[PDB]
RNA sequence: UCGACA
DNA sequence: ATGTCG
């Protein structure tokens, strides 16, 4: 129905797809660009999307903040809730950055709780989700 | 054979 | 185009 505005919105940036993925989270009140991550020479959009969700994660837990996470990206919040990016990107020497970073978070996944709600953007209601590039 | 989300 | 799910 409505947007909960105490929350944190991530999105995904790229360059080519796959290609140059980059993401973001910002307040989807004020706006304001709480994290944004240094370009990740090769990778696809839901791995993007699927680290920035995790990336929220990580950082409102740190600071003990209970505000729910948007994402657009329907393959992202899925692949969170299984803790299991399902990715179909070949696993090799150009794409191993991203693949360790999605390990990773994985691995963050698997050890670490969390009571974040990760709510779907309702961009045909509510327009282009706040951390859209 | 589609329908969605990006 | 390409990456993904139902
Ligand atoms: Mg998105
Ligand atoms: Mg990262
Ligand atoms: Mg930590
Ligand atoms: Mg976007």
Partial sequence: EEIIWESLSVDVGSQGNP????YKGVD????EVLFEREPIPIGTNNMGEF??????????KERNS???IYSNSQTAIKWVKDKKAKSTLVRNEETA?????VDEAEEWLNTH???????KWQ????GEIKADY
Wanted: glycine fraction near 8%; aromatic fraction near 10%.
């Fill in 19 to 22: 290609g140059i993925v980059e």
């Fill in 28 to 31: 989807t009140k004020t706006g």
């Fill in 51 to 60: 680290l920035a969700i995790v990336h929220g994660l990580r950082y409102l």
């Fill in 66 to 68: 209970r505000k729910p």
């Fill in 97 to 101: 950055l991203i693949w360790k970073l």
């Fill in 113 to 119: 709780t969390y009571e974040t709600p990760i709510l």
């Fill in 123 to 126: 961009t045909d209601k509510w």
